[PDB]
Each structure stands twice: as C-alpha cells, then as structure tokens.
Design a protein around this motif. Structure first.
Motif, PDB file in Angstrom:
ATOM      1  N   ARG A 262      40.793  33.082  39.931  1.00 47.82           N
ATOM      2  CA  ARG A 262      40.382  34.382  39.381  1.00 47.82           C
ATOM      3  C   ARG A 262      40.325  34.449  37.837  1.00 47.82           C
ATOM      4  O   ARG A 262      41.323  34.745  37.184  1.00 47.82           O
ATOM      5  CB  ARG A 262      41.335  35.463  39.913  1.00 47.82           C
TER       6      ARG A 262
ATOM      7  N   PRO B  98      37.489  59.569  38.054  1.00 47.81           N
ATOM      8  CA  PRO B  98      38.397  58.648  38.738  1.00 47.81           C
ATOM      9  C   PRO B  98      37.786  57.960  39.946  1.00 47.81           C
ATOM     10  O   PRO B  98      38.087  56.762  40.178  1.00 47.81           O
ATOM     11  CB  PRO B  98      39.559  59.551  39.187  1.00 47.81           C
TER      12      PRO B  98
ATOM     13  N   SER C  33      35.600  50.070  48.958  1.00 47.92           N
ATOM     14  CA  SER C  33      34.938  49.224  47.947  1.00 47.92           C
ATOM     15  C   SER C  33      35.806  48.952  46.736  1.00 47.92           C
ATOM     16  O   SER C  33      35.496  48.061  45.928  1.00 47.92           O
ATOM     17  CB  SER C  33      33.606  49.839  47.483  1.00 47.92           C
TER      18      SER C  33
ATOM     19  N   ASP D  45      39.533  45.674  43.777  1.00 48.86           N
ATOM     20  CA  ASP D  45      40.286  45.253  42.600  1.00 48.86           C
ATOM     21  C   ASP D  45      41.457  46.211  42.323  1.00 48.86           C
ATOM     22  O   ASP D  45      42.518  45.776  41.931  1.00 48.86           O
ATOM     23  CB  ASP D  45      39.375  45.065  41.361  1.00 48.86           C
TER      24      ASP D  45
ATOM     25  N   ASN E 165      43.093  55.681  42.501  1.00 49.78           N
ATOM     26  CA  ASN E 165      42.211  56.226  41.494  1.00 49.78           C
ATOM     27  C   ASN E 165      42.385  57.716  41.353  1.00 49.78           C
ATOM     28  O   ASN E 165      41.905  58.510  42.202  1.00 49.78           O
ATOM     29  CB  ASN E 165      40.815  55.865  41.896  1.00 49.78           C
TER      30      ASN E 165
ATOM     31  N   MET F 275      30.403  41.984  46.545  1.00 49.03           N
ATOM     32  CA  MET F 275      31.727  41.698  47.077  1.00 49.03           C
ATOM     33  C   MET F 275      32.808  42.502  46.380  1.00 49.03           C
ATOM     34  O   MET F 275      34.002  42.204  46.566  1.00 49.03           O
ATOM     35  CB  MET F 275      32.019  40.209  47.002  1.00 49.03           C
ATOM     36  N   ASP F 276      32.392  43.511  45.607  1.00 49.31           N
ATOM     37  CA  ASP F 276      33.333  44.436  44.941  1.00 49.31           C
ATOM     38  C   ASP F 276      34.198  43.710  43.919  1.00 49.31           C
ATOM     39  O   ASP F 276      35.370  44.077  43.691  1.00 49.31           O
ATOM     40  CB  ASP F 276      34.207  45.209  45.973  1.00 49.31           C
ATOM     41  N   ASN F 277      33.648  42.660  43.313  1.00 48.41           N
ATOM     42  CA  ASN F 277      34.334  41.940  42.260  1.00 48.41           C
ATOM     43  C   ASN F 277      33.909  42.401  40.889  1.00 48.41           C
ATOM     44  O   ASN F 277      32.797  42.064  40.456  1.00 48.41           O
ATOM     45  CB  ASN F 277      34.133  40.442  42.403  1.00 48.41           C
ATOM     46  N   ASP F 278      34.801  43.104  40.191  1.00 48.33           N
ATOM     47  CA  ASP F 278      34.439  43.707  38.928  1.00 48.33           C
ATOM     48  C   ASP F 278      34.765  42.838  37.716  1.00 48.33           C
ATOM     49  O   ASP F 278      34.770  43.335  36.581  1.00 48.33           O
ATOM     50  CB  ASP F 278      35.026  45.108  38.784  1.00 48.33           C
ATOM     51  N   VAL F 279      34.912  41.543  37.970  1.00 49.69           N
ATOM     52  CA  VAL F 279      35.222  40.591  36.905  1.00 49.69           C
ATOM     53  C   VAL F 279      34.224  40.805  35.766  1.00 49.69           C
ATOM     54  O   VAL F 279      33.012  40.964  36.023  1.00 49.69           O
ATOM     55  CB  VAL F 279      35.192  39.139  37.402  1.00 49.69           C
TER      56      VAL F 279
END
Ligand SMILES: [Mg+2]
Ligand SMILES: [Mg+2]
Lengths: 224, 226
Positions: free
Chosen positions: A45, A141, B83, B86, B54, A70-74
């Motif tokens: 990661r 939010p 979703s 993270d 959140n 894939m909901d990866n906010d990297v």
C-alpha cells in the motif's frame, strides 16, 4: 519515509525517477506496467503513486480507472500529455489527482508528490453538513453531490474541489488558494485548477450556472 | 441493560438505530458527530459504541484515535457506506474492534454488539507465561508483544487476535473459529474482518524478520516459526 510507487514502461525513466525520488528522501517501489502497478499497490500500500499513461499490458488510465472502481483513494499523479485534439488529460477525468507532462525536471515531481502526501495526511474536518447552492446539494461528510436530486458522479479530487468551494460558498477563491487547500501545494505554474474547474462546470451544468470563473480574481460557487 | 452509544450524522439513520436497539434490549444514548460522541462517552460511559466514520466536526477515525489515546478500551463497531473502504479500514487501524457496512439489517448490528460485549476488555486464553514464537514474544497477561525485544504497537483487537493465535501456537485456526474466539460471534457472518486484521497484524510483525503468521489457503491461519 513516505512510500511512493513509480510506474513507467520506459526502464530508463523508471530508474531515473527511482534514484531521484530516493535521494529526495522517499521510500520507492517501482512497476513496469499497469499490472505490476496494481500488484505493487496491493502488496505494499503506497502513500502515493506516480503513474505513466502509455504502457503495455495495462495502461495508466486503466490503472486509475481500476483503482477508483475498487474504492482505492490512493493519491495519484499521472505523467501524461494534453491531447492535440482535444486538450484532454488523459488520466485526470478517470480519477487521478494531478499531472505532469514529460519532459519535466525532478523538482516538479517532488513538489507534486509532497502535495499529494500533504492532502492525504490532512485530518482537518469541517463542521459543515449538507451545503445548498440553488439546485445543488453537497453532502460534505458523505462525499456526495446532487443537482435537483440527481447524483453528480465526481472523482475524489473533483469532489475535494467542489467541497472547498461549497465550504466557502459565494466566496471567490483564487487559483493559489485552491492549489493550497485542495492540492496541498506549498510552492506553481500549473493549469490543474482551471482544468478541474472546467470538469466541474461541465458535470454541474449537464441547469443554471453555479460555478463562476472571475478572471484575474478566482472562482466562486454561487446560485446565479 | 447494557448501555450502547450510537453515533451518526444522518438523523434518519440515528433515529432508526436508536429505536431498534432500544427495542432489542439496550439502553441507548445518541450523538450526531464525534464531539458529541466523546462528550457522551465521557459523561456516561457506555458499554459499547456504534460509530459512523464519516461525520462533521470530528469524524469516526478521530473519535477512535482519541479514545485509544486515553487508554479507553470501550468496544467500538464502526459503520460506513459500502464504497468507503479506506475510511472503515482507517477506523479499524486506529483501534475499532469491528465494522458493519451500510445499509444493513438491524439483526447484523445487534449480533455484533452482543459479540463486542462478550469479548470486551480480555481473551479466550489461559496461558500465563509469555509465549515465544521464534523472535516473537506474546505476553498475554501483560498485553505486550515484542519482536527481538522491541515492542510491537497493536490495537486492542489486533492484540486479541495475536493472543488467540499464540495460545494455539502452531495450530491452524479458521476464519469462523477466529470470529468465535476473538470476536465472540455466535452467528454466521459475511465479513472480511478476520482477513483485515490478519493483514495489519502480519505487517506489524514483519515490522523491522521471518514470516510468523501464515495463511493456509482454504483452511485458516497459523502462527509459527519457519
Ligand atoms: Mg510509457
Ligand atoms: Mg455519516
């Protein structure tokens, strides 16, 4: 040291970025194509990804598309170009956070990577809930936006920008201010704010105009 | 009779969960953001906290981070949208004990809260002596793990997992056994919580050396040297 994954199918460029980033104080992982990038991003990661666009096996827009799907906010900075035809970039629309056009000097990449990491590490949280601007509702939010009750599909950095604009709704925020608040810059000659502003205006108006460009002053979200 | 604090900035969800948990036998307190959550937890200590990630003002990650910094081991189940991967992972890494993804049916939450309360503050193990696995020492009574003499910083539930694995050193324990032994589950669950924590734990152990925490595909997980 923050872990940066660098991805480029040009082995000389890859080695040169690896060496320079390492000497600038980063922990560096490398990948030669998009498949190797996805494997690396999974196994180790990274805190940020520097991602070439044109590669064999799996190209950079496909990598960004897959990460976001894939909901990866990297954080991702793409090494891209503006099309000649039709001035598109070429990874930004797909979900990348910033870009640089080759050839570039290493200092430009370091500055952008530090900004990526500064945004990623920010724990500042607003008191704002759902902000209304005419037909636009921004759930801060919840990271959702709707216009007349219809979802607006935004990338992470499109929403980050909309969010700041809405937190300061009716206020005109300059390009420098947005580079600071949204991209985490502390230093730049880039058009990335202007590009993303155009993305948002296009998606929001898909409608009255809510996002205004005030030449020589800045940008403002306000019910027309 | 157990007191559960429920925290969510979506007032419809907050109201639904308050109603449903009260009917299901809990004394319920509510909060609309993380600051209200910390005040409520401070002023009338709950037995468990159900915590949306959140939120405005202070988010669920910050809430968990604050609680753990104050050495408050109150069990926490974090909620998030499907979703928001993270975010819920961040809440687990910061110290939360379990998670549930929105939307969910109430039974799934009630079940996880009863589990939290069964496994709150102490593990299903009886070893007293510190347990050694190559360079790793797991001191279950002292709640301390060290690799080559240096402490490994683990959350409460990460340590709970390592302690069960070390109590059963060299033995393979399946995902379902670990949900029962570590999480206190008495029900079939669709969750990745064991895998998530096995990952965090493995990364921390490997840390400075050898892999000690092994995944036996289709069978389970085992702590052992080599
Ligand atoms: Mg290339
Ligand atoms: Mg929420």
């Amino acid at each position: 040291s923050p872990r940066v994954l660098v991805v480029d199918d040009d082995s000389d460029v890859l080695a040169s970025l690896e060496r320079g980033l390492r000497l600038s104080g980063f922990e560096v992982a490398t990948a030669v194509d998009g498949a190797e990038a996805l494997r690396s991003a999974t196994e180790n990661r990274p805190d940020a990804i520097v991602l070439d666009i044109n590669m064999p096996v799996l190209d950079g827009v496909s990598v960004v598309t897959a990460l976001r799907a894939m909901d990866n906010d990297v954080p991702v900075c793409v090494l891209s170009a503006r099309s000649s035809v039709d001035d598109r970039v070429a990874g930004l629309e797909a979900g990348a956070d910033d870009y640089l056009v080759k050839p570039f000097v290493l200092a430009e990449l370091v500055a952008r990577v530090k900004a990526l990491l500064r945004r990623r590490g920010s724990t500042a949280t607003s008191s704002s809930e759902t902000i209304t601007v005419g037909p636009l509702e921004v759930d801060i939010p919840g990271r959702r936006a709707r216009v007349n009750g219809v979802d607006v599909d935004l990338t992470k950095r499109e929403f980050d920008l909309l969010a700041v604009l809405a937190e300061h709704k009716t206020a005109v925020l300059s390009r420098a201010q947005l580079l600071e608040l949204v991209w985490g810059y502390d230093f730049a000659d880039t058009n990335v704010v202007d590009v993303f502003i155009g993305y948002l205006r296009r998606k929001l108006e898909a409608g009255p105009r809510l996002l205004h460009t005030v030449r020589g002053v800045g940008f403002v979200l306000r019910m027309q």
